């Protein structure tokens, strides 16, 4: 499973560009795709989404009317065409795969994003922490809060916990507030209620340092928390 | 869709795509010609195979149709436990060797091979599942049988018989004997062909019989009958 | 002018026949539609055409009680000025749509029988929908001009909702009627005849003519042709002669007979609904199997 | 034939020497099991529509 | 000769077995349960209808979570359904379209199928590529596969038409054990709740109890007059039910080693395709060739209710683990959920 991004570079304001994401090692046509950008030193920010079969397309309010998302399935590639770029669009962009059926885990793989630099109602997720000085071998508890109720009428609480190590793309840890992703150690656990959520790490192994993000998937304008940093 | 969440909507869309694929596959497979091969012992199966353990499938295209051919000669289990799986085939091709009119089975005494082949035809033709399925009867080894009449008459098979000992009439007597076993002469009939070595008339006759079967199947579907 | 002394004939003959036709033909179409929706949900290509024909027959029969009351009282159409035009439009719209649906079914049968191997798009369930849409569009286009050519007025005695033949402004109804007939009846009649004579000829030849299926199919085809001809020729013919006779210096010694012939001719075009129900639904084996299946399910 | 018969005889001998239980005790045990779980059978005793997963 | 002595000894052993079984029958099940209250009338209606199969549905199986199920049709399709929302989760195309059996792994990671190709195919559902692919292909039977059941992620038990049953290690694809002794095509099998024994029903009008690890036949039960098509194990694990072609169902007890109850009616003359038990074991559901399913009081042997919504032969049925619904498939290419 690999996603490789091409494009980026210096762009003058008002210009245009086309970012590409080439997929290999999995059934590309069966996965919905997302473009997610992160500012130089900010948190993650959802940008766009295209469904499997190109039947449904969603954009963020900041890029609506300016960006276009498309996919070529025979060539196994995903395109993001950007026009009228402003100076606030400088960020690193990732293409993310996600499949939706009963019991699936969306957002389970992130490509190594590409950097772009430009020359000079909505659920609010609060992560009211910035740095937690920690020592190895002791439990930690990260907390996230939402301005709405993420619990649906079908009993599913749509909250996702991601971890970003320094110099790496974010990886999925917890989906739907309780389900541990494949390949994740048993130390990480998720719990909470309709509004307040907690991620617990039992015993650190001096590798879990990084930034933890909480994201909601109840409604398609997707919101990420500010992020919590774990340093030793 | 008023209360469905984002993931529920995505799952519904995936199910819709699956349904579309299933419909396409079904409509592609509906216009196909499926034939079931049957016979007693070794009476010609590879020779009948013309590319123009378990169950053996053969796929071939003649002009623009897709022909599937199922051979179940290797299945040694009880026939009544799976014979309903083939209820709906376009045609049943029954192969019979004309050379078995004088040679009997050595495994079991007094068990003539032609008599042992008529019982299988009687079972298959008058079946609860094949009441309407078309049956194509092939009579192979016509030439080799033709020269055998000079020594052993047809009385070896049917003692209650009297007629000219030539191919042109002894073969027709067997033609009638196999055809009278049908007890549903109306709304069902048998297309019988004498196999030839020209290698081309067999597929032409099979095509004609299949075309006539499909015409009568279309008559029922479009309310004319 | 000329006296309408044949109003007793309209008084006690048209309402009785129309009411009988409506009474026995409404529940039949409803039952057929319900059976198609429930017990035959796979909806093969021919089932779509049959459902469309049943729906247009129900729409046709819906407009019967209005004329039933119009003729039962003799006169005094009290449903309004727009309602008369709408009803007279709907009657002809449904009639010609049924004609076109029969023609489309005959073409489909010809394609599926004469060429059982060299036509595969017909069996697709997406061709029938397109054909039905085109039939509806043609019917709407052909019947829309008649709405503004229908005369509706009161003679300070009764409000007479008149039809095309008895309507005023001749020399405009005549040419529109001629074009409408020659386009939407004369051509489909020839198409149906050519498609069914070939079917009969290929059924009487070929291979295995002794089958019970072929004889039944040929007899049913003859019955279909006879029903179509009998139900649809006299109506149009007598319409043409009536329209022409109203535009001449002929006397009323035979004008009343012409008008009465037209009046008698219309209920045959009504009765073709019964013909369709008998010869297109009941005779089919699939419908009998479906009704037997639901009856057995109710029993058990 | 010799082995065909000897193996059958040995199998019958193995099957014969078993410990059996009176039929009354078997019926009593089946009845007791059916009674002890009577309230945990949704099909036998239908549940209210509030807690039925297959409501429409 | 020695064969005469051996057959005489076999007849003596059969007589001894018959005497031992006869001496144990002092009271019947009906007499013991004569004064218990009846269940009344069982009324159940269809809640869901699953459409998408274009041919006869031959087998189905429920998941452990009682929400997902699998079904196989003879159009080369294995469809996985989410019954709550009717949505389709997976559709697997089979290499051979003559499928006749289904199995769902208790963990939910694997499915198994097989039929007229004398091969059991095992498909892996959880992959990193997002598609269901063939994980294993067990071969070695010389007859059509009629039933298969998982024991865990690495052990399966199959029965087929060569009068033998097999226990397969999936990882190496080898026949770990072979169970022999039936004189006719083996048509059904059923595992014990603790997964240490299993019962098998064949066409020789007899059922056999097998120990999984030892591979030896413990008991043989007779009484039917035709081929046995279905077999189901009682929730307690000390009895089982059998359905055959003579239009009767029968109940057998392991410890009593004989027959207990017979379920038959004068108006039923068709064969029985499937049998299943309710959660408490008081109701027995049997599908018939006359397009119906019948519910029987397992204790009083009385007819309780009928399920009639199928236009063709009912071929398979199954009750969920929590007993909240029953799924029924049929040759009319539809599945229905009832409760
Ligand atoms: C002068 C105006 C008088 C109008 C009244 C006359 C006649 C009414 C009737 C019919 C037009 C019937 C049309 C069939 C067409 S339309 C369906 C659709 N276009 C599609 O194929 O996608 C095809 O289905 C036949 C092609 C055969 C084949 O290729 O196998
Ligand atoms: C007087 C006006 C409203 C008449 C218009 C007819 C409308 C109301 C109805 C009558 C019968 C209907 C059709 C019946 C069956 C089918 C096949 C289905 O697969 C697609 C829709 C389609 C094609 C329907 C479209 C709508 C339809 C044409």
PDB file of C-alpha atoms in Angstrom, chain E residues 67-314:
ATOM      1  CA  UNK E  67     -26.397  -8.997  12.163  1.00  0.00           C
ATOM      2  CA  UNK E  68     -24.386 -10.152   9.130  1.00  0.00           C
ATOM      3  CA  UNK E  69     -25.247 -13.224   7.081  1.00  0.00           C
ATOM      4  CA  UNK E  70     -23.900 -14.929   3.969  1.00  0.00           C
ATOM      5  CA  UNK E  71     -25.791 -16.584   1.131  1.00  0.00           C
ATOM      6  CA  UNK E  72     -24.782 -18.523  -1.984  1.00  0.00           C
ATOM      7  CA  UNK E  73     -26.695 -18.804  -5.241  1.00  0.00           C
ATOM      8  CA  UNK E  74     -26.153 -20.907  -8.356  1.00  0.00           C
ATOM      9  CA  UNK E  75     -25.250 -17.857 -10.420  1.00  0.00           C
ATOM     10  CA  UNK E  76     -21.667 -17.721  -9.139  1.00  0.00           C
ATOM     11  CA  UNK E  77     -22.476 -15.306  -6.315  1.00  0.00           C
ATOM     12  CA  UNK E  78     -21.692 -15.274  -2.591  1.00  0.00           C
ATOM     13  CA  UNK E  79     -23.398 -12.217  -1.080  1.00  0.00           C
ATOM     14  CA  UNK E  80     -22.865 -10.917   2.462  1.00  0.00           C
ATOM     15  CA  UNK E  81     -25.880  -9.040   3.829  1.00  0.00           C
ATOM     16  CA  UNK E  82     -26.316  -6.615   6.702  1.00  0.00           C
ATOM     17  CA  UNK E  83     -29.839  -7.592   7.714  1.00  0.00           C
ATOM     18  CA  UNK E  84     -30.605  -4.485   9.788  1.00  0.00           C
ATOM     19  CA  UNK E  85     -30.269  -2.083   6.842  1.00  0.00           C
ATOM     20  CA  UNK E  86     -30.591  -4.587   3.935  1.00  0.00           C
ATOM     21  CA  UNK E  87     -27.319  -3.175   2.575  1.00  0.00           C
ATOM     22  CA  UNK E  88     -24.860  -5.416   0.737  1.00  0.00           C
ATOM     23  CA  UNK E  89     -21.401  -5.557   2.306  1.00  0.00           C
ATOM     24  CA  UNK E  90     -19.571  -7.898  -0.092  1.00  0.00           C
ATOM     25  CA  UNK E  91     -20.288  -9.758  -3.327  1.00  0.00           C
ATOM     26  CA  UNK E  92     -17.824 -12.541  -4.173  1.00  0.00           C
ATOM     27  CA  UNK E  93     -17.791 -14.203  -7.623  1.00  0.00           C
ATOM     28  CA  UNK E  94     -17.013 -17.920  -7.467  1.00  0.00           C
ATOM     29  CA  UNK E  95     -14.775 -19.749  -9.921  1.00  0.00           C
ATOM     30  CA  UNK E  96     -17.366 -22.546 -10.104  1.00  0.00           C
ATOM     31  CA  UNK E  97     -21.039 -21.569 -10.200  1.00  0.00           C
ATOM     32  CA  UNK E  98     -22.336 -24.942  -8.931  1.00  0.00           C
ATOM     33  CA  UNK E  99     -22.134 -23.946  -5.273  1.00  0.00           C
ATOM     34  CA  UNK E 100     -24.144 -25.985  -2.781  1.00  0.00           C
ATOM     35  CA  UNK E 101     -22.955 -25.050   0.731  1.00  0.00           C
ATOM     36  CA  UNK E 102     -22.010 -22.046   2.869  1.00  0.00           C
ATOM     37  CA  UNK E 103     -20.089 -21.398   6.068  1.00  0.00           C
ATOM     38  CA  UNK E 104     -19.233 -18.286   8.092  1.00  0.00           C
ATOM     39  CA  UNK E 105     -16.257 -18.320  10.446  1.00  0.00           C
ATOM     40  CA  UNK E 106     -17.191 -17.719  14.111  1.00  0.00           C
ATOM     41  CA  UNK E 107     -14.598 -14.931  14.279  1.00  0.00           C
ATOM     42  CA  UNK E 108     -16.057 -13.335  11.144  1.00  0.00           C
ATOM     43  CA  UNK E 109     -12.790 -13.206   9.184  1.00  0.00           C
ATOM     44  CA  UNK E 110     -13.411 -16.038   6.695  1.00  0.00           C
ATOM     45  CA  UNK E 111     -16.152 -17.578   4.591  1.00  0.00           C
ATOM     46  CA  UNK E 112     -16.255 -21.017   2.998  1.00  0.00           C
ATOM     47  CA  UNK E 113     -18.143 -22.425   0.027  1.00  0.00           C
ATOM     48  CA  UNK E 114     -18.248 -25.536  -2.120  1.00  0.00           C
ATOM     49  CA  UNK E 115     -20.379 -27.749  -4.305  1.00  0.00           C
ATOM     50  CA  UNK E 116     -20.284 -29.894  -7.475  1.00  0.00           C
ATOM     51  CA  UNK E 117     -16.549 -29.150  -8.051  1.00  0.00           C
ATOM     52  CA  UNK E 118     -15.387 -31.438  -5.189  1.00  0.00           C
ATOM     53  CA  UNK E 119     -13.437 -28.521  -3.695  1.00  0.00           C
ATOM     54  CA  UNK E 120     -13.890 -26.364  -0.589  1.00  0.00           C
ATOM     55  CA  UNK E 121     -12.882 -22.738  -1.144  1.00  0.00           C
ATOM     56  CA  UNK E 122     -12.011 -20.467   1.787  1.00  0.00           C
ATOM     57  CA  UNK E 123     -12.160 -16.695   1.241  1.00  0.00           C
ATOM     58  CA  UNK E 124     -10.457 -14.108   3.450  1.00  0.00           C
ATOM     59  CA  UNK E 125     -12.607 -11.073   4.241  1.00  0.00           C
ATOM     60  CA  UNK E 126     -10.141  -8.775   6.061  1.00  0.00           C
ATOM     61  CA  UNK E 127      -7.339  -7.728   3.705  1.00  0.00           C
ATOM     62  CA  UNK E 128      -5.105  -4.692   3.297  1.00  0.00           C
ATOM     63  CA  UNK E 129      -6.032  -4.358  -0.393  1.00  0.00           C
ATOM     64  CA  UNK E 130      -9.759  -3.919   0.256  1.00  0.00           C
ATOM     65  CA  UNK E 131     -10.912  -6.911  -1.811  1.00  0.00           C
ATOM     66  CA  UNK E 132     -12.001 -10.433  -0.903  1.00  0.00           C
ATOM     67  CA  UNK E 133      -9.551 -12.957  -2.347  1.00  0.00           C
ATOM     68  CA  UNK E 134      -9.238 -16.737  -2.300  1.00  0.00           C
ATOM     69  CA  UNK E 135      -7.140 -17.744   0.703  1.00  0.00           C
ATOM     70  CA  UNK E 136      -7.355 -21.541   0.514  1.00  0.00           C
ATOM     71  CA  UNK E 137      -8.589 -24.319  -1.793  1.00  0.00           C
ATOM     72  CA  UNK E 138      -8.991 -27.695  -0.083  1.00  0.00           C
ATOM     73  CA  UNK E 139      -9.233 -30.718  -2.382  1.00  0.00           C
ATOM     74  CA  UNK E 140      -9.284 -34.461  -1.826  1.00  0.00           C
ATOM     75  CA  UNK E 141     -12.948 -35.422  -1.767  1.00  0.00           C
ATOM     76  CA  UNK E 142     -14.175 -37.610  -4.631  1.00  0.00           C
ATOM     77  CA  UNK E 143     -17.769 -36.353  -4.536  1.00  0.00           C
ATOM     78  CA  UNK E 144     -19.788 -33.170  -4.439  1.00  0.00           C
ATOM     79  CA  UNK E 145     -19.467 -31.098  -1.271  1.00  0.00           C
ATOM     80  CA  UNK E 146     -22.734 -30.851   0.660  1.00  0.00           C
ATOM     81  CA  UNK E 147     -21.836 -29.212   3.989  1.00  0.00           C
ATOM     82  CA  UNK E 148     -18.933 -27.413   5.648  1.00  0.00           C
ATOM     83  CA  UNK E 149     -18.519 -25.938   9.131  1.00  0.00           C
ATOM     84  CA  UNK E 150     -15.702 -23.970  10.747  1.00  0.00           C
ATOM     85  CA  UNK E 151     -14.275 -24.966  14.119  1.00  0.00           C
ATOM     86  CA  UNK E 152     -11.880 -22.014  14.361  1.00  0.00           C
ATOM     87  CA  UNK E 153      -9.758 -19.922  11.996  1.00  0.00           C
ATOM     88  CA  UNK E 154      -7.574 -22.949  11.147  1.00  0.00           C
ATOM     89  CA  UNK E 155      -9.885 -25.997  11.247  1.00  0.00           C
ATOM     90  CA  UNK E 156     -12.854 -26.997   9.099  1.00  0.00           C
ATOM     91  CA  UNK E 157     -15.126 -30.037   8.835  1.00  0.00           C
ATOM     92  CA  UNK E 158     -16.689 -31.017   5.513  1.00  0.00           C
ATOM     93  CA  UNK E 159     -19.036 -33.735   4.306  1.00  0.00           C
ATOM     94  CA  UNK E 160     -19.416 -34.824   0.702  1.00  0.00           C
ATOM     95  CA  UNK E 161     -20.999 -37.395  -1.587  1.00  0.00           C
ATOM     96  CA  UNK E 162     -18.324 -40.103  -1.388  1.00  0.00           C
ATOM     97  CA  UNK E 163     -19.835 -41.379   1.908  1.00  0.00           C
ATOM     98  CA  UNK E 164     -17.002 -39.818   3.948  1.00  0.00           C
ATOM     99  CA  UNK E 165     -16.427 -36.790   6.161  1.00  0.00           C
ATOM    100  CA  UNK E 166     -13.164 -34.916   6.616  1.00  0.00           C
ATOM    101  CA  UNK E 167     -11.474 -32.620   9.124  1.00  0.00           C
ATOM    102  CA  UNK E 168      -9.069 -30.219   7.399  1.00  0.00           C
ATOM    103  CA  UNK E 169      -6.204 -28.114   8.697  1.00  0.00           C
ATOM    104  CA  UNK E 170      -6.607 -24.948   6.634  1.00  0.00           C
ATOM    105  CA  UNK E 171      -3.040 -23.648   6.982  1.00  0.00           C
ATOM    106  CA  UNK E 172      -1.407 -26.666   5.323  1.00  0.00           C
ATOM    107  CA  UNK E 173      -4.456 -27.655   3.258  1.00  0.00           C
ATOM    108  CA  UNK E 174      -4.279 -31.317   4.283  1.00  0.00           C
ATOM    109  CA  UNK E 175      -6.895 -33.814   5.449  1.00  0.00           C
ATOM    110  CA  UNK E 176      -6.042 -34.067   9.140  1.00  0.00           C
ATOM    111  CA  UNK E 177      -8.746 -36.672   9.805  1.00  0.00           C
ATOM    112  CA  UNK E 178     -11.156 -38.814   7.786  1.00  0.00           C
ATOM    113  CA  UNK E 179     -14.430 -40.231   9.130  1.00  0.00           C
ATOM    114  CA  UNK E 180     -15.751 -43.301   7.307  1.00  0.00           C
ATOM    115  CA  UNK E 181     -18.642 -45.681   7.854  1.00  0.00           C
ATOM    116  CA  UNK E 182     -21.622 -44.308   5.950  1.00  0.00           C
ATOM    117  CA  UNK E 183     -22.962 -46.427   3.089  1.00  0.00           C
ATOM    118  CA  UNK E 184     -24.577 -43.511   1.241  1.00  0.00           C
ATOM    119  CA  UNK E 185     -24.035 -39.898   0.284  1.00  0.00           C
ATOM    120  CA  UNK E 186     -23.519 -37.772   3.392  1.00  0.00           C
ATOM    121  CA  UNK E 187     -26.000 -34.910   3.161  1.00  0.00           C
ATOM    122  CA  UNK E 188     -25.655 -32.896   6.378  1.00  0.00           C
ATOM    123  CA  UNK E 189     -23.550 -32.376   9.493  1.00  0.00           C
ATOM    124  CA  UNK E 190     -23.918 -30.443  12.740  1.00  0.00           C
ATOM    125  CA  UNK E 191     -21.300 -29.547  15.357  1.00  0.00           C
ATOM    126  CA  UNK E 192     -21.859 -29.700  19.099  1.00  0.00           C
ATOM    127  CA  UNK E 193     -22.052 -26.386  20.993  1.00  0.00           C
ATOM    128  CA  UNK E 194     -18.781 -27.198  22.789  1.00  0.00           C
ATOM    129  CA  UNK E 195     -17.205 -28.328  19.468  1.00  0.00           C
ATOM    130  CA  UNK E 196     -16.017 -31.772  20.480  1.00  0.00           C
ATOM    131  CA  UNK E 197     -18.477 -34.046  18.622  1.00  0.00           C
ATOM    132  CA  UNK E 198     -20.581 -33.772  15.506  1.00  0.00           C
ATOM    133  CA  UNK E 199     -23.559 -35.621  14.050  1.00  0.00           C
ATOM    134  CA  UNK E 200     -23.830 -36.513  10.371  1.00  0.00           C
ATOM    135  CA  UNK E 201     -26.859 -37.540   8.335  1.00  0.00           C
ATOM    136  CA  UNK E 202     -26.576 -39.443   5.057  1.00  0.00           C
ATOM    137  CA  UNK E 203     -28.706 -41.137   2.390  1.00  0.00           C
ATOM    138  CA  UNK E 204     -28.591 -44.585   4.041  1.00  0.00           C
ATOM    139  CA  UNK E 205     -31.424 -43.466   6.379  1.00  0.00           C
ATOM    140  CA  UNK E 206     -29.103 -43.359   9.389  1.00  0.00           C
ATOM    141  CA  UNK E 207     -27.279 -40.749  11.460  1.00  0.00           C
ATOM    142  CA  UNK E 208     -23.886 -41.114  13.118  1.00  0.00           C
ATOM    143  CA  UNK E 209     -22.134 -39.412  16.034  1.00  0.00           C
ATOM    144  CA  UNK E 210     -18.415 -38.729  15.552  1.00  0.00           C
ATOM    145  CA  UNK E 211     -15.713 -37.718  18.014  1.00  0.00           C
ATOM    146  CA  UNK E 212     -13.636 -35.015  16.345  1.00  0.00           C
ATOM    147  CA  UNK E 213     -10.217 -35.744  17.846  1.00  0.00           C
ATOM    148  CA  UNK E 214     -10.405 -39.551  17.879  1.00  0.00           C
ATOM    149  CA  UNK E 215     -12.079 -39.963  14.484  1.00  0.00           C
ATOM    150  CA  UNK E 216     -14.268 -42.862  15.602  1.00  0.00           C
ATOM    151  CA  UNK E 217     -18.009 -43.469  15.420  1.00  0.00           C
ATOM    152  CA  UNK E 218     -19.591 -43.507  18.875  1.00  0.00           C
ATOM    153  CA  UNK E 219     -23.269 -44.153  18.106  1.00  0.00           C
ATOM    154  CA  UNK E 220     -25.532 -44.887  15.139  1.00  0.00           C
ATOM    155  CA  UNK E 221     -29.203 -43.871  15.071  1.00  0.00           C
ATOM    156  CA  UNK E 222     -31.811 -45.375  12.743  1.00  0.00           C
ATOM    157  CA  UNK E 223     -35.547 -45.108  12.194  1.00  0.00           C
ATOM    158  CA  UNK E 224     -36.009 -42.973   9.095  1.00  0.00           C
ATOM    159  CA  UNK E 225     -37.301 -44.553   5.887  1.00  0.00           C
ATOM    160  CA  UNK E 226     -35.574 -42.367   3.273  1.00  0.00           C
ATOM    161  CA  UNK E 227     -32.611 -40.065   2.690  1.00  0.00           C
ATOM    162  CA  UNK E 228     -31.837 -37.647   5.523  1.00  0.00           C
ATOM    163  CA  UNK E 229     -31.434 -34.095   4.222  1.00  0.00           C
ATOM    164  CA  UNK E 230     -31.027 -31.980   7.369  1.00  0.00           C
ATOM    165  CA  UNK E 231     -29.588 -32.357  10.864  1.00  0.00           C
ATOM    166  CA  UNK E 232     -29.555 -29.907  13.793  1.00  0.00           C
ATOM    167  CA  UNK E 233     -28.142 -30.092  17.305  1.00  0.00           C
ATOM    168  CA  UNK E 234     -30.195 -29.318  20.418  1.00  0.00           C
ATOM    169  CA  UNK E 235     -29.033 -26.245  22.405  1.00  0.00           C
ATOM    170  CA  UNK E 236     -28.331 -28.372  25.486  1.00  0.00           C
ATOM    171  CA  UNK E 237     -26.113 -30.674  23.434  1.00  0.00           C
ATOM    172  CA  UNK E 238     -27.687 -33.977  24.526  1.00  0.00           C
ATOM    173  CA  UNK E 239     -30.136 -34.494  21.634  1.00  0.00           C
ATOM    174  CA  UNK E 240     -30.612 -33.666  17.973  1.00  0.00           C
ATOM    175  CA  UNK E 241     -33.264 -33.440  15.263  1.00  0.00           C
ATOM    176  CA  UNK E 242     -33.351 -35.123  11.860  1.00  0.00           C
ATOM    177  CA  UNK E 243     -35.390 -34.417   8.729  1.00  0.00           C
ATOM    178  CA  UNK E 244     -35.707 -36.686   5.711  1.00  0.00           C
ATOM    179  CA  UNK E 245     -37.688 -37.424   2.537  1.00  0.00           C
ATOM    180  CA  UNK E 246     -40.511 -39.402   4.198  1.00  0.00           C
ATOM    181  CA  UNK E 247     -42.154 -36.134   5.360  1.00  0.00           C
ATOM    182  CA  UNK E 248     -41.295 -36.709   9.034  1.00  0.00           C
ATOM    183  CA  UNK E 249     -38.963 -35.131  11.569  1.00  0.00           C
ATOM    184  CA  UNK E 250     -37.471 -37.125  14.427  1.00  0.00           C
ATOM    185  CA  UNK E 251     -35.716 -36.383  17.715  1.00  0.00           C
ATOM    186  CA  UNK E 252     -32.873 -38.547  19.034  1.00  0.00           C
ATOM    187  CA  UNK E 253     -31.225 -38.528  22.464  1.00  0.00           C
ATOM    188  CA  UNK E 254     -27.523 -39.277  22.861  1.00  0.00           C
ATOM    189  CA  UNK E 255     -27.638 -40.597  26.433  1.00  0.00           C
ATOM    190  CA  UNK E 256     -30.799 -42.668  25.963  1.00  0.00           C
ATOM    191  CA  UNK E 257     -29.308 -43.854  22.636  1.00  0.00           C
ATOM    192  CA  UNK E 258     -32.711 -44.153  20.952  1.00  0.00           C
ATOM    193  CA  UNK E 259     -35.645 -42.215  19.493  1.00  0.00           C
ATOM    194  CA  UNK E 260     -37.801 -39.820  21.517  1.00  0.00           C
ATOM    195  CA  UNK E 261     -40.357 -37.977  19.361  1.00  0.00           C
ATOM    196  CA  UNK E 262     -41.735 -37.984  15.814  1.00  0.00           C
ATOM    197  CA  UNK E 263     -43.203 -34.889  14.131  1.00  0.00           C
ATOM    198  CA  UNK E 264     -45.484 -35.717  11.204  1.00  0.00           C
ATOM    199  CA  UNK E 265     -48.884 -34.764   9.816  1.00  0.00           C
ATOM    200  CA  UNK E 266     -51.311 -36.545   7.509  1.00  0.00           C
ATOM    201  CA  UNK E 267     -51.461 -33.568   5.120  1.00  0.00           C
ATOM    202  CA  UNK E 268     -47.667 -33.359   4.634  1.00  0.00           C
ATOM    203  CA  UNK E 269     -46.212 -35.624   1.942  1.00  0.00           C
ATOM    204  CA  UNK E 270     -43.232 -33.621   0.641  1.00  0.00           C
ATOM    205  CA  UNK E 271     -39.623 -33.810   1.757  1.00  0.00           C
ATOM    206  CA  UNK E 272     -37.906 -31.709   4.405  1.00  0.00           C
ATOM    207  CA  UNK E 273     -34.889 -29.589   3.485  1.00  0.00           C
ATOM    208  CA  UNK E 274     -33.877 -27.810   6.702  1.00  0.00           C
ATOM    209  CA  UNK E 275     -34.297 -28.027  10.473  1.00  0.00           C
ATOM    210  CA  UNK E 276     -33.445 -25.558  13.223  1.00  0.00           C
ATOM    211  CA  UNK E 277     -34.113 -24.946  16.907  1.00  0.00           C
ATOM    212  CA  UNK E 278     -35.122 -21.856  18.844  1.00  0.00           C
ATOM    213  CA  UNK E 279     -32.927 -20.361  21.565  1.00  0.00           C
ATOM    214  CA  UNK E 280     -34.648 -22.268  24.380  1.00  0.00           C
ATOM    215  CA  UNK E 281     -35.093 -25.384  22.236  1.00  0.00           C
ATOM    216  CA  UNK E 282     -38.888 -25.484  22.552  1.00  0.00           C
ATOM    217  CA  UNK E 283     -39.717 -24.719  18.899  1.00  0.00           C
ATOM    218  CA  UNK E 284     -38.449 -26.672  15.886  1.00  0.00           C
ATOM    219  CA  UNK E 285     -38.580 -24.991  12.472  1.00  0.00           C
ATOM    220  CA  UNK E 286     -38.574 -27.149   9.339  1.00  0.00           C
ATOM    221  CA  UNK E 287     -38.684 -26.064   5.701  1.00  0.00           C
ATOM    222  CA  UNK E 288     -40.548 -28.210   3.193  1.00  0.00           C
ATOM    223  CA  UNK E 289     -40.772 -28.752  -0.557  1.00  0.00           C
ATOM    224  CA  UNK E 290     -44.345 -27.390  -0.612  1.00  0.00           C
ATOM    225  CA  UNK E 291     -42.972 -23.819  -0.262  1.00  0.00           C
ATOM    226  CA  UNK E 292     -43.708 -23.627   3.481  1.00  0.00           C
ATOM    227  CA  UNK E 293     -41.969 -23.589   6.842  1.00  0.00           C
ATOM    228  CA  UNK E 294     -43.568 -25.311   9.833  1.00  0.00           C
ATOM    229  CA  UNK E 295     -43.050 -24.586  13.533  1.00  0.00           C
ATOM    230  CA  UNK E 296     -43.385 -27.600  15.833  1.00  0.00           C
ATOM    231  CA  UNK E 297     -43.717 -27.805  19.597  1.00  0.00           C
ATOM    232  CA  UNK E 298     -40.630 -29.895  20.343  1.00  0.00           C
ATOM    233  CA  UNK E 299     -42.147 -31.320  23.539  1.00  0.00           C
ATOM    234  CA  UNK E 300     -45.824 -31.956  22.732  1.00  0.00           C
ATOM    235  CA  UNK E 301     -45.239 -32.699  19.008  1.00  0.00           C
ATOM    236  CA  UNK E 302     -48.012 -30.322  17.937  1.00  0.00           C
ATOM    237  CA  UNK E 303     -48.147 -27.946  14.989  1.00  0.00           C
ATOM    238  CA  UNK E 304     -47.798 -24.342  16.169  1.00  0.00           C
ATOM    239  CA  UNK E 305     -47.585 -22.111  13.096  1.00  0.00           C
ATOM    240  CA  UNK E 306     -46.605 -21.763   9.464  1.00  0.00           C
ATOM    241  CA  UNK E 307     -44.440 -19.320   7.532  1.00  0.00           C
ATOM    242  CA  UNK E 308     -45.720 -18.985   3.951  1.00  0.00           C
ATOM    243  CA  UNK E 309     -44.196 -16.261   1.801  1.00  0.00           C
ATOM    244  CA  UNK E 310     -42.083 -18.088  -0.775  1.00  0.00           C
ATOM    245  CA  UNK E 311     -43.062 -18.962  -4.345  1.00  0.00           C
ATOM    246  CA  UNK E 312     -40.724 -21.966  -4.664  1.00  0.00           C
ATOM    247  CA  UNK E 313     -38.992 -24.654  -2.613  1.00  0.00           C
ATOM    248  CA  UNK E 314     -37.584 -23.537   0.736  1.00  0.00           C
TER     249      UNK E 314
END
